[PDB]
């Protein structure tokens, strides 16, 4: 019974590989029916094929309010409104950072999870009950991080009263197919900055967020869970 | 000590209250100074009590167009500007879950984009000449303290996470970006309040008093100074122990 | 297979009653085989007591290395050294500073700060020549000058000690309860209650076991990559 | 009459050299009357000597309660009481807990902590009987980095910020100046390629200057800085 999912509905935004599919992945081995989300159809369908009976994947586009109310309401219609919102889409030079880079940034790392999280808290806190985590995986790229644990804070304290904890996971150098391409010269240079002298594995993040998601993380809100080796 | 004689220093927001302050302080330690209101009366107003020590210029943050032209006139008549001070606190009190999209937008384009534009619009001057400073300040704490200004809790955090990387990128070319955040100052708000009202909302602050717009203005001056050279990446907070 | 602790070796100081119990309870629970102490024999035995086959009690003052020592060479004679060492033992001795005494200060710090150095420093060797160790410091937001600076020493320290050590497999954290329900909150009146309560926007006091949660989490293998960080158990405190 | 010190007593530990030596001076050239400490006779004569009219030099250790009672007597019989502390006084005893020994961690604790809450408490009872008073604690540089030191730094901004809620409503103010890499006797030291490796870390691209920490110092010293407590102003080009 510990850490245990079942009955829970968790919608993963951003699923198709990394950690994000990771976290699908792992929410539904706990027992979790997982809707994990892509930008396209044949990106959901992938996650349709990994999960199988475990949920299914839908197209999202976070920067789209239409496309936000059409999918909770299909995933509401099917499974019942949302338990766990985990918030990992996102995207990635001062002097020339250009106008577009900067909204594009804040659109989609910032402004989403406060959409996708005002959408999902009236079911979850009519149920007295509900998770939701932000993954906070360069300038812009800073302001819209440190905005949304400001905003974790903040909204985490509006609604803790009513079960629902508001948390991130912030992770540090994790494993991607993009880190893999990098040469070895430019990997050796990474992992000084490491104490642990290795990156992370998916699956690590996958873990801290499936802690947060669970019952034993009740009185746990308006926290962020660095999981970066040692890192800062 | 603290001298700013020579420098230009441009204050957005210097109408009222702390940026009217801050630019009356920078113009008692030397500088010559711009502060900025939406109107043209507001400039007006500001002129009229800087008198000989700089002028006032209508200014709207979230416009492009008006950003290029105030700095252009102020590159004309006074030379580049080498102390920019956003207001970057202009906000009224709401809950998270109460706003709606079109308050976070406009909040984030007002506090936080408006920190970007501006401060890359006087970028290149400072590292030109090797010298500079940009001081955010962060908005007032009101009635309904931190959890009043929930709805301004992203931007804020927002503007210190682009100081703190900001900072990191232009430091060798002698440019120096701090925060300043201010806890419970005086206001005309504050002011209107009875006696029993005001010792209710200075419980939260070990102080027992309410900061005076004065104090923030110290503050910034401090760092707006040669003698903060070091400080950078840094959040002064000017609360009177609240928190 | 997931968060199991089964073949570890956890010792968990100051587990007679509360956060310590809990926590120990819940590494037994999970598979680890657990030493709880207590500073008298009595206290060791009830540990023992509610342990049974999963571990035992023993007497342990912190702020003795002699018994530090002896501790150390029961727990690895019988069980094998160390793998999980769980710092809760501490004090509070609160005051105004102005009428705070030498020994209200110097107690907190030795008990609740130079524990963790000297606690530290005895299970450590073992555990790098594993390649594997997890220590959590648990530090209770609880006139508290000395009980603060101790605290917020105990997290300096984690997050120097974790630099130099993650790279041989050690993690080393710390948990930071909020209020929780103990023995000595359960004694105040109702007004006193609901008067702490307005502080926690979760409105409610925690539960011991929330902290042994967090706790075992970070114990496990599935928290390998977590290291120098401060978990905060608060319902929002802060 | 700006951030002026005029007819304030200062009192500054370990001000014998560097940070601390600029600290006493700067605040001497703003008017106050300056006390600053070293661990022998010898020292706090040539603090005497630095500073001339605007004060002495007293020897003190602040390990030692009796040290302390005896040099807050003798501040207060010749000057008045003290206003402005400043904790500068510390020292390092560098090690991997592995092999770090009892008499390292404790010397340290002693020396860098303790030595601030006796300090800070001896001098407390004078500042609030003026309702004025400061505090100042700097949390030392950082050296080609010094493990430690690094529990008794966190302590001695833990107990800032705690001691700060309970004084504040009588008008004193307590803060923590944390300095980076500064220029001091040891980094000259150096060698050159060991200056540029420290300085790679330093996005300012220089070492600062001990006057640098002084002014942050002389700043929440002064009477400008009145609402400012419990707070630490870190003073290091960007780094981390
Ligand atoms: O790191 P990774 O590229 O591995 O994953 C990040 C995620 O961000 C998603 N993403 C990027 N932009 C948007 C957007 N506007 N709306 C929704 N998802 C987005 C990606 O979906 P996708 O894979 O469809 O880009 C992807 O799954
Ligand atoms: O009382 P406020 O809290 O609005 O005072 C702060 C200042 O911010 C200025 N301000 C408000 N909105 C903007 C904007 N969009 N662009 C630039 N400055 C602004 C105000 O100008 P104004 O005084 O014209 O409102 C005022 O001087
Ligand atoms: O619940 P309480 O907060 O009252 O105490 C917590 C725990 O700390 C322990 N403790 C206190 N001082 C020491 C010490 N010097 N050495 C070891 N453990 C100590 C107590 O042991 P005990 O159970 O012996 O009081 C208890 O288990
Ligand atoms: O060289 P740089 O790196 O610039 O500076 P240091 O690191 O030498 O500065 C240390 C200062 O603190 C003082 N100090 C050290 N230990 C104690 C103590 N136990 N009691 C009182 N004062 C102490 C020293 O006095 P002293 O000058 O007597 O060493 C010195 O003035």
Same mark, same amino acid.
């Given at each position: ?20 599919? &990771? ?15 892509? +930008? ?8 349709? *094929? ?24 299909? #995933? ?7 338990? #766990? ?9 001062? /002097? ?58 903040? /909204? ?17 150098? #994790? ?14 240079? +990474? ?9 992370? *594995? ?7 967020? &499936? ?22």
């Amino acid at each position: 019974q510990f850490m245990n999912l079942e009955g829970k509905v968790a919608l993963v935004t951003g699923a198709s590989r990394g950690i994000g599919k &990771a976290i699908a992945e792992l929410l539904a081995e706990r027992g979790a029916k997982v809707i994990g989300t892509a +930008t396209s159809e044949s990106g959901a369908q992938a996650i349709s *094929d990994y999960l199988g009976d475990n949920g299914k994947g839908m197209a999202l586009n976070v920067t789209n309010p239409e496309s936000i109310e059409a999918v909770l309401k299909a #995933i509401t219609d099917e499974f019942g409104g949302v338990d #766990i919102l985990v918030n990992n889409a996102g995207i990635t030079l001062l /002097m020339r950072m250009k106008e577009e880079e900067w909204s594009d940034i804040m659109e989609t790392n910032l402004t989403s999870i406060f959409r996708l999280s005002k959408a999902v808290l009236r079911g979850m806190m009519k149920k007295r009950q509900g998770r939701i985590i932000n993954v906070a995986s360069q300038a812009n790229y800073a302001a819209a991080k440190a905005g949304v644990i400001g905003f974790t804070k903040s /909204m985490a304290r509006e609604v803790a009263s009513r079960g629902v904890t508001v948390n991130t996971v912030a992770p540090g150098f #994790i494993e991607t197919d993009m880190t893999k391409a990098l040469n070895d010269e430019q990997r050796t240079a +990474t992992l000084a900055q490491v104490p642990a002298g290795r990156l992370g *594995d998916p699956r690590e993040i996958a873990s801290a967020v &499936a802690f947060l998601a669970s019952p034993e993380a009740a009185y746990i809100t308006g926290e962020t869970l660095h999981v970066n080796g040692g890192m800062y």
